[model samples]
Target: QAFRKFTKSERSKDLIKEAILDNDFMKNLELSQIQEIVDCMYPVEYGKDSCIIKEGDVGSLVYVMEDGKVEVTKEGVKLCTMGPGKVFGELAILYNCTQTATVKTLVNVKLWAIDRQCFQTIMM
Candidate 1:
């Protein structure tokens, strides 16, 4: 499959290992399963003030912050800030529903994210 091709790269493998170790939700996954999940993840970037997850949007992706910071807000009220090694947008995927809050970049950010379908497949 198209995703598998990404796993062939050493960088991809390293990213997978790093993600598994750094992400709390991924801690239980074996290395082999982590590789499969990494294949489905792709790097994403957002500039400061850019919306990463819009409140009430049907959540389709779960993101792990690889660099920089993001702010969580609900109805224009700021909740908290998150940084590298943090994970977000997962409740939507886990509950199979809409995003509960808006996440905006406080600075330029690098993220690794997977779509709902791929995340479900990997977790199954």
Candidate 2:
């Protein structure tokens, strides 16, 4: 009861499920685990050209993309661009880790995100 859950419509739930279902680490978990993660996530959004991740900063929340795009860069070079279904800051689900690159949204973004406490209690 300590870990509260966010409510979502069936459509919203399906979108959240698909956003992480095929991703890197979430794919390793059972369906119920993924569902629990979805329950804990809340919506997040950012407008165009906004910096989402800063280099060397500690990861506070894990995010899954529902829409829009972003570009990742480190040091002096551009790494790659990402769009819907991409997950970032996911290592925070296990433990706090430092982000290696700075990420900025290329367009407005719709994301679902969860904090470390919610994720840790669910998995621990």
Candidate 3:
């Protein structure tokens, strides 16, 4: 509760808000929905060459890139690269299955993560 209060103002104008609303997937979200999502986001980071998400792992959180870049791989093949404003690791929670791809950092990265519980709550 204290944490939430202290972070409320920052959350209101945070990167997740800018990222989500800027993206096609969330372009239709209402103001209230956007606020709820930002409120639940928690900051995270990954170093260069680190594996952010591994395929076949149980994914309980989804992330939105705040800075830096990541590469997506499937079956050891590079699928694509993504940068700021991209959201990933969502399919597992959305479908209740294992991660389908591995996300590895190309540079030091900052992100905002929302767990499955928080995601489901806001979506509901």
Candidate 4:
């Protein structure tokens, strides 16, 4: 409760609200459904220049880019940039066996993520 209050005080409501409203993730997904899939989500944070996911790592979760930018690379080669409200890690979370590329934070970032089990549940 205190943490939520503090986060609200920090003016994260707009960010959260926008995420809930504009994201395709919530378009067809009902709040009740989210409750069922809550277990599949984990709160994660990363610092600038830190590696969040590595290529060839087990692809289990779909990452929702809540804030900041991440550079996607493969075999140490730069691929592309990912920004807020964009979703990545899909290939691994849904189809691929391992991560296709590495994701590194360009700045301090916070991400709310869900894994395969919950993704299926939410879609269903």
Candidate 5:
């Protein structure tokens, strides 16, 4: 990934490591692979009710929830609520396509977002 590696404290990296490892989608990777992903991730935040990822939008980032909640929806139908440490909004990066659902903040939220290109580069 050619994206700028953002600054993060040791504690932040540890938390990110824990979050990624906790998710089943990521747990299967090699330890070093996971570490590489954690190192490449950067922090981002959104306010209450704000859209994180809009459906039909072709995106370039994958988000992992660090705190607060998100409600996922498709065509205005509720999918489910994702809480802290939950990984979502990955469909965009999982394929060369658009977002399948809308991910909106339920309240103030902090997340770790990774650039799609960076992810591909990591696993390439």
Candidate 6:
């Protein structure tokens, strides 16, 4: 697989940390599984007011709020505010369903995320 091609890269462990922080579906994932999941991920960043994940978008990812504030909205209705060390989108990630809500950055934000296709590949 393409993963073997990047084993020599410097960014490898950072990608694994991102995987650990963001992967809610992997709450039960073992350490080895986490490393395998990381092998398939790349990093992502967002600007202020950016919609990190939109309601109803087919996810290739689940997200962890590494830092900053985000508002959770369902059909444009505010549900809650989330801060760092929080995880979102597991429900959608697992079910392959439409996002139940919209998440908007309340300030400048950054996140680590993985797409669903990559996650499924790792899970197998």
Candidate with maximal lDDT: 5
Q: What is the lDDT of residue 84 in candidate 6?
A: 67
Per-model TM against the reference:
0.79, 0.87, 0.82, 0.65, 0.86, 0.72
Best model per TM-score: 2
Model 6, runs deviating above 4 Å: 1-25
Q: What tens digits encode model 2's per-residue C-alpha lDDT throughout 1-124?
A: 2366898768767876776777767777777878888899888999999999888888888787778998989995889988887788876446566888888999999888888777777676
Give a tens-digit lDDT track for model 4, residues 37-90: 443455678999998889889876677677789999998888998777566776
Model 1, 4-121: lDDT tens per residue?
3233356645655675677676777876667777778778899988999898899888787777999999988999998876678877887878988999999999888887777787
Q: Which stretches of candidate 3 lie over 4 Å from their true place?
A: 1-14, 22-25
- RMSD (CA, Å), candidate 1 to true, equals 2.8
Candidate lDDT (C-alpha), each: 0.78, 0.80, 0.80, 0.66, 0.82, 0.68
In the range 55-88, model 3's lDDT, one tens digit per residue, is: 9999889788877999999999999998987788
Candidate RMSDs in Å, in order, are: 2.8, 1.8, 3.1, 5.6, 1.9, 3.8
Candidate 6, residues 1-124, lDDT tens digits: the string is 2242124244545545654656555667877767765565455567888888788887657666666789999866899998765667767867778887889999887665666666666666
**Lowest-lDDT window of 10 residues in candidate 3?**
1-10
Q: How does residue 61 of candidate 4 score in lDDT?
A: 68
**Given candidate 3, what's the lDDT at residue 80?**
97
> Which residue pairs in candidate 5 have backbone atoms (N, alpha carbon, C) closer than 3 angstroms, thus clashing?
1-118
Which sections of candidate 4 miss by over 4 Å? 1-42
Report the number of backbone clashes for model 5. Answer: 1
Off by over 4 Å in 2: 92-95
- What's model 6's overall lDDT? 0.68
Cα displacement (angstroms), candidate 1, residue 25, comes to: 4.5
